[PDB]
Design an enzyme around this catalytic site. Structure first.
Site, short mmCIF file in Angstrom:
data_model
loop_
_atom_site.label_atom_id
_atom_site.label_comp_id
_atom_site.label_asym_id
_atom_site.label_seq_id
_atom_site.Cartn_x
_atom_site.Cartn_y
_atom_site.Cartn_z
N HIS A 174 28.17 8.65 42.86
CA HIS A 174 26.90 8.28 42.22
C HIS A 174 26.83 6.95 41.31
O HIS A 174 25.75 6.51 40.77
CB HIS A 174 26.79 9.47 41.29
CG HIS A 174 27.18 9.62 40.04
ND1 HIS A 174 28.51 10.42 39.63
CD2 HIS A 174 27.00 9.16 38.67
CE1 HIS A 174 28.49 10.36 38.34
NE2 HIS A 174 27.71 9.71 37.92
N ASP A 183 31.57 13.49 45.11
CA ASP A 183 31.14 12.57 44.37
C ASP A 183 32.39 11.47 44.42
O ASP A 183 33.28 11.68 43.22
CB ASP A 183 30.74 12.92 43.23
CG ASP A 183 29.94 12.03 42.25
OD1 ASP A 183 29.58 10.81 42.74
OD2 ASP A 183 29.86 12.13 41.20
N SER A 191 31.06 8.26 33.53
CA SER A 191 30.90 8.09 35.03
C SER A 191 31.87 7.41 36.02
O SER A 191 32.12 6.17 35.72
CB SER A 191 29.44 8.03 35.53
OG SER A 191 28.48 9.18 35.49
N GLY A 192 32.50 7.97 36.76
CA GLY A 192 33.44 7.45 37.80
C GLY A 192 34.88 7.22 37.27
O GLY A 192 35.81 6.78 38.17
N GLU A 206 40.63 -4.36 30.70
CA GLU A 206 39.73 -4.39 29.40
C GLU A 206 39.85 -3.67 28.28
O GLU A 206 40.77 -2.40 28.39
CB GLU A 206 38.43 -4.14 30.09
CG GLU A 206 37.63 -5.11 30.73
CD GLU A 206 37.00 -6.03 29.74
OE1 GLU A 206 37.38 -6.47 28.78
OE2 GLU A 206 36.14 -6.77 30.45
N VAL A 262 34.19 -8.54 24.50
CA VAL A 262 35.06 -9.76 23.98
C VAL A 262 35.83 -10.09 25.30
O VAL A 262 36.78 -9.08 25.54
CB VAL A 262 35.57 -9.59 22.66
CG1 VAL A 262 36.38 -10.71 22.01
CG2 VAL A 262 34.58 -9.13 21.78
N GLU A 292 42.36 -9.46 30.74
CA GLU A 292 41.41 -9.37 31.74
C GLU A 292 41.57 -9.95 33.09
O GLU A 292 42.03 -11.11 33.25
CB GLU A 292 39.87 -9.91 31.49
CG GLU A 292 39.18 -8.99 30.15
CD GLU A 292 39.58 -9.91 28.72
OE1 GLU A 292 40.22 -10.72 28.59
OE2 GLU A 292 38.85 -9.49 27.79
N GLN A 336 27.56 9.97 29.21
CA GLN A 336 27.01 8.88 29.87
C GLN A 336 27.50 7.53 29.86
O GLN A 336 27.82 7.14 28.78
CB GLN A 336 25.47 8.97 29.86
CG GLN A 336 24.45 8.11 29.65
CD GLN A 336 24.58 6.92 30.61
OE1 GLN A 336 24.79 5.70 30.57
NE2 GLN A 336 23.73 7.42 31.90
N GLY A 337 28.00 7.14 30.98
CA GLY A 337 28.57 5.85 30.89
C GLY A 337 30.24 6.03 31.28
O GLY A 337 30.95 5.08 31.37
N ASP A 384 33.97 15.98 25.02
CA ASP A 384 33.53 15.97 26.12
C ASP A 384 33.24 14.28 26.92
O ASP A 384 33.34 13.53 25.98
CB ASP A 384 32.00 16.48 26.56
CG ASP A 384 31.67 17.27 27.88
OD1 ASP A 384 32.51 16.93 28.79
OD2 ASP A 384 30.65 17.56 27.92
N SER A 385 33.38 14.03 28.07
CA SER A 385 32.86 12.82 28.50
C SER A 385 31.44 12.70 28.44
O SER A 385 30.61 13.85 28.46
CB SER A 385 33.08 12.64 29.89
OG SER A 385 33.07 13.66 30.77
N1 LIG Z 1 29.19 17.20 30.22
C1 LIG Z 1 29.44 15.74 30.30
C2 LIG Z 1 30.51 15.45 30.93
C3 LIG Z 1 29.29 15.41 31.68
C4 LIG Z 1 28.86 13.98 31.86
C5 LIG Z 1 27.43 13.62 31.62
C6 LIG Z 1 26.86 12.50 31.76
C7 LIG Z 1 27.78 11.53 32.55
C8 LIG Z 1 29.17 11.70 32.75
C9 LIG Z 1 29.68 13.15 32.60
CA LIG Z 2 37.41 -7.75 27.21
#
Ligand SMILES: [NH3+][C@H]1C[C@@H]1c1ccccc1
Ligand SMILES: [Ca+2]
Length: 223
Positions: free
Chosen positions: A40, A84, A177-178, A52, A57, A62, A174-175, A171-172
């Site tokens: 995604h 994914d 991701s991956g 990084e 900066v 890098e 937004q951003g 938790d992880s």
């Molecule tokens: N419950 C959060 C881990 C899940 C998440 C949401 C949005 C992007 C990446 C991960």
């Molecule tokens: Ca940097």
């Protein structure tokens, strides 16, 4: 990352930032010329940024290398997020050292109860927004399959695992991701999806990398 800690500059040497004029997704270096991320996160014109810590900066460690080819998993379904995972080949090989290093692929799937390190530059708040410039880290266990399917009825496939805390607060997000979920020195998960971030009984869902090791190996042997 919500409820995590500052990793420390270059203490997660396999962590990459995918940049298309701005950071939009994390990723993991699996050898000097290949990066694995979430499907995604697919975009044309990806520059891979290695070494990084502060992504706003230039600090001196890098390596910015453009992508030459991207391969989204052949059965990626963007509606369900099943499979994914994506591979990205670098135009030239990264220069590997203590601060830029590849992470090992697993030979075995990790069990529920295993403690893991999740890292990224995503949102640090579950309510509202604040993006860090330096890399954040989170230690979280792999959750049992049945607690994972109970939190997300009818949504967890065999290519997913949950990791985190059913109590919420860590938790992880937004951003992130991956990005990588590393357990005992091996890449086991890719930050994939979840219901909001750090919510009670809504842990993060991760792509189960041990299922994809032979597609990864076959694909980099041929491209
Ligand atoms: N419950 C959060 C881990 C899940 C998440 C949401 C949005 C992007 C990446 C991960
Ligand atoms: Ca940097």
């Amino acid at each position: 990352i919500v409820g995590g800690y500052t990793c420390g500059a270059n203490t997660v040497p396999y962590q990459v930032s995918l940049n298309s004029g701005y950071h939009f997704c994390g990723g993991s270096l699996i050898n000097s010329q290949w990066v694995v991320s979430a499907a995604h996160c697919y975009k044309s014109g990806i520059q891979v940024r290695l070494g990084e810590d502060n992504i706003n900066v230039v600090e001196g460690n890098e390596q910015f290398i453009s992508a030459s080819k991207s391969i989204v998993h052949p059965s990626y379904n963007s509606n369900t997020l099943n499979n994914d995972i994506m591979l990205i080949k670098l135009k030239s090989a990264a220069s590997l050292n203590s601060r830029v290093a590849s992470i090992s692929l697993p030979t075995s799937c990790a069990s529920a109860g295993t403690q893991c390190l999740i890292s990224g530059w995503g949102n640090t708040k579950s309510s509202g927004t604040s993006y860090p410039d330096v890399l954040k880290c989170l230690k979280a266990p792999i959750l049992s399959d049945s607690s994972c399917k109970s939190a997300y009825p009818g949504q967890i496939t065999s290519n997913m695992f949950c990791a985190g805390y059913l109590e919420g607060g860590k938790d992880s997000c937004q951003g992130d991701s991956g990005g990588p979920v590393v357990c005992s020195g091996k890449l086991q998960g890719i930050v994939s999806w979840g219901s909001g971030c750090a919510q009670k009984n809504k842990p993060g869902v991760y792509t189960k990398v041990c299922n994809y090791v032979s597609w990864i190996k076959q694909t980099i042997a041929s491209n």
